[PDB]
Amino acid sequence: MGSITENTSWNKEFSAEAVNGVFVLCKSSSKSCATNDLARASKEYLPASTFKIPNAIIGLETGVIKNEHQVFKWDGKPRAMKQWERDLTLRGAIQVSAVPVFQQIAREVGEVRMQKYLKKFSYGNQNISGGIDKFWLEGQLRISAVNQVEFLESLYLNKLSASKENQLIVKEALVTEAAPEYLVHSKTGFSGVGTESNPGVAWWVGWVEKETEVYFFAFNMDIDNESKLPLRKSIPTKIMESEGII
Amino acid sequence: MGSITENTSWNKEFSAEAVNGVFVLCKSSSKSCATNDLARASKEYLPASTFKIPNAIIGLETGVIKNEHQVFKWDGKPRAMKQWERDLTLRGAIQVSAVPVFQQIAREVGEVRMQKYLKKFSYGNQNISGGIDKFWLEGQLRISAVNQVEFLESLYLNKLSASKENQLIVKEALVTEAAPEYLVHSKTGFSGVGTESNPGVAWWVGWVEKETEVYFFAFNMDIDNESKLPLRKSIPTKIMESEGIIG
Ligand code: NA
Ligand code: NA
């Protein structure tokens, strides 16, 4: 989504760190969202690691991922991070953001089915061109913070074009904080440090269930140095703590 | 389960707190369980609050609970705990162990259906005598720690006689700790202090998903003073920490 309203009270959390970015926070639904930056809220960026959310759903829907207990075996050959050099469950691969596991899922899904599902999901600009195993890493796919919270709301409500079972499976894999009072589902992304005069993007997207309320959120920021990466969680966390949500 | 073995390594965690209790810990991959006390692992106790797990599944299966987004509204009449005096989701009602919500679920399920599902689930002695809204807390229902882990393994595998959807809904409601390397699902129970002569029971049951391994656990202890209640989590947590599973 409905209106997007600007909230100036969050800018201090960005300025304190010299961060150029956006937070979008929607209470109850995407009908009413708040943001620090109206223009950037709808600006589209490479999804990077946040693409594992639709990719997992599509993997399950197509049967490429058999069910939530499938183990993705490591073939013993070098992977870019040591934490990826092991057998992984679906939740495990999401939580350590094991790119090679999801590259193989994408290859098996294939371009025709991938395009079909991103159209169904209204996922960003739906541009998968240039390489089926890297379009979300270095390709032309782009999605905004507002679109992320619309997509996550659909997932929360089990309203994506997928079985409820498969949406529930992916939601369980995204739980990142549990307390009696609230539950956080979320996913990070980081495209890289970019190139000269062209920074990369870092993301944190998800939702919070607190009492009988739900809050959808999406954060992104420009980033050209990996030492800044934790700000993708700390800035939105500080905003949501000051709102009383977590 | 495939096998069970008694292990003395864990007794020190009980003796340090002067607790009479049992821990059962089962590793899925090896189909192997260990316990500090084989006799007590087979003893059957009131499930108390741990019964919210089957009760939630049954409520969903029967349609008494619509789905995971149903809100259980507070009517404004005082409840035994201020923390229950509010609208609650299914997860919320499970996490604060809101007795009156699940009493009403049980009433709507009814005796005939409740009996049928506890038979399907092989849940304890399947005796629901004592009142449809109290049999798990003050009635004749009894379940052992071994039976709890058998039941929880079936839930984890979506092998209970319920839709996978409803098993998944209840599993999400049971998540109590999330870390990048492991996920804990769990539920507490407490029957009361009983007497000095005949103490109550306190429970902590659940499972841990770590790497590709899954550990099913059930803890219970005698309890005659509510000040000891935190031990139902701290003793099994210290044991699972010393095995390298959590923390
Ligand atoms: Na790799
Ligand atoms: Na981070």
Torsion region of A244: left, alpha or beta (phi above 0 gives left; psi -120 to 50 gives alpha): left
Residue B49 DSSP label: G
| Containing structural domain, residue A108 | 3-244
The C-alpha atoms of residue A232 and residue A201 are separated, in whole angstroms, by 10
- A91 and B165: CB-CB below 8 Å? no
The C-alpha atoms of residue B130 and residue B110 are separated, in whole angstroms, by 13
The C-alpha atoms of residue A156 and residue B86 are separated, in whole angstroms, by 23
Which tokens go with A115? 């395009």
Helix, strand, coil share (%) of chain A residues, nearest 5: 40, 25, 35
By the 8 A CB rule, do B169 and B68 touch?
Answer: yes
The C-alpha atoms of residue A85 and residue A80 are separated, in whole angstroms, by 9
By the 8 A CB rule, do B239 and B23 touch?
Answer: yes
Torsion of CA B222, B227, B228, B230, to 10 degrees: 130
The Å distance, Cα A160 to ligand 1 centre, comes to 30
DSSP state string for B25-86: EEETTTTEEEES-HHHHH-EE--GGGGHHHHHHHHHHHTSS--TT-EE---SS--SSGGGSS
- B212 and A92: CB-CB below 8 Å? yes
User: Could you tell me how many residues make up chain A?
Assistant: 246
Q: Which residues of A touch B86 (CB under 8 A)?
A: 211
- Domain CATH for A126: 3.40.710.10
Three-state DSSP class for residue A93 = helix
Candidates B70, B101, B183: best to mutate against A (most CBs of A within 10 A) is B183
Torsion of CA A20, A26, A29, A30, to 10 degrees: -30
Catalytic residue set of A: 49
By the 8 A CB rule, do A15 and A43 touch?
Answer: no
Q: Which residues of A touch B212 (CB under 8 A)?
A: 71, 87-89, 92
The Å distance, Cα A101 to ligand 1 centre, comes to 8
Which tokens go with A67? 């069910």
Structurally, chain A folds into a number of domains equal to 1
Resolution (angstroms) equals 1.6
Q: Which residues of B touch A95 (CB under 8 A)?
A: 180-181
By the 8 A CB rule, do B108 and B64 touch?
Answer: yes
Which tokens go with B139? 């009635």
The C-alpha atoms of residue B86 and residue B96 are separated, in whole angstroms, by 11
The C-alpha atoms of residue B99 and residue B52 are separated, in whole angstroms, by 9
Residues 6+ apart with CB under 8 A from B176: A178, A180, B95, B184, B185, B186, B206
Which tokens go with B151? 């039941």
The C-alpha atoms of residue B191 and residue A233 are separated, in whole angstroms, by 41
